[PDB]
Amino acid sequence: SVVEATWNDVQLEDSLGMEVGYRLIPMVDFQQDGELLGRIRSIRKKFAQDMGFLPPVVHIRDNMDLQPARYRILMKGVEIGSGDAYPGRWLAINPGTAAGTLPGEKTVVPAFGLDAIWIESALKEQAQIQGFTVVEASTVVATHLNHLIGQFSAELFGRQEAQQLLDRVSQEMPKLTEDLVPGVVTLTTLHKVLQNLLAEKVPIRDMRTILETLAEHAPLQSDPHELTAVVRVALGRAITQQWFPGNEEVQVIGLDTALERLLLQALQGGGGLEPGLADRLLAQTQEALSRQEMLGAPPVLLVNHALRPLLSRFLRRSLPQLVVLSNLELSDNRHIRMTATIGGK
């Protein structure tokens, strides 16, 4: 080569990254406009003021093995999503209800999970008025990034990100922090708690309540999978108001009184559930899920407080659409009504 090899030639693995074909470099250009880097900043901003932490910088490099207009989205090196985005063009998408068609390569685009037609620039006002939603091309990439962050936010929330958060908390209630870590709770434990929380879509903007609650219970208990369940109940009014806004009815999914004990039994001296139960749940569970999807009701299962740690650990890795709550985490001022059940069909 021209210049001698130095340690600066060691590229470390990026927490969150992106690779881009040459036809897309113009929208990821530092020097030129950067039509996309604007949209990425707005995602990282609107994520911290919303989910309570700053996602890690998106390291974008180009890679010439890719098609001209293809992007890969990477996490810690592994590709976690990819798609095609064409700069001169726009995208037209039916929300499921519009009528008409249009000229183009019909593609079930990966960013939205809907069917949609890439169209050229001038058909805009017509596509909007036939019933379509018309987006720019950077917006396609950006929207695709945004789903991937809010689906991997548990694994993007690394220990280095937890310390960085602890330092933002520590400048607005320094009392709280000075003696909770590494005093009563080790940063390992705190991180395992906030990660278990981000994992089930539970916002952690209320550090005031999470540290107050830990500092109360940490001396007499230090299993994260146990403190997690107790921070959850501290956040009950906030979790309730997440999936059930207003003070109207609470149309939940529940499980059967016998099935409850069936599992409650398998809990005590069991190291895990047995194979037979397994496949019955997921079918019987997806059964009740499909009813609520027609009725207009949310996908929330409401279980006994000792069953939630493990129905969510078991069901969610198949149907991550599913929210698994606890009767102890709902507000009392709320009217319940189990409008779908998990029993003998």
Swiss-Prot record:
Top-level taxon: Bacteria
Family: Belongs to the FHIPEP (flagella/HR/invasion proteins export pore) family.
Organism: Salmonella typhimurium (strain LT2 / SGSC1412 / ATCC 700720)
Biological role stated in the UniProt entry: Required for formation of the rod structure of the flagellar apparatus. Together with FliI and FliH, may constitute the export apparatus of flagellin.
Protein name, as recorded: Flagellar biosynthesis protein FlhA
Localization of this protein: Cell inner membrane
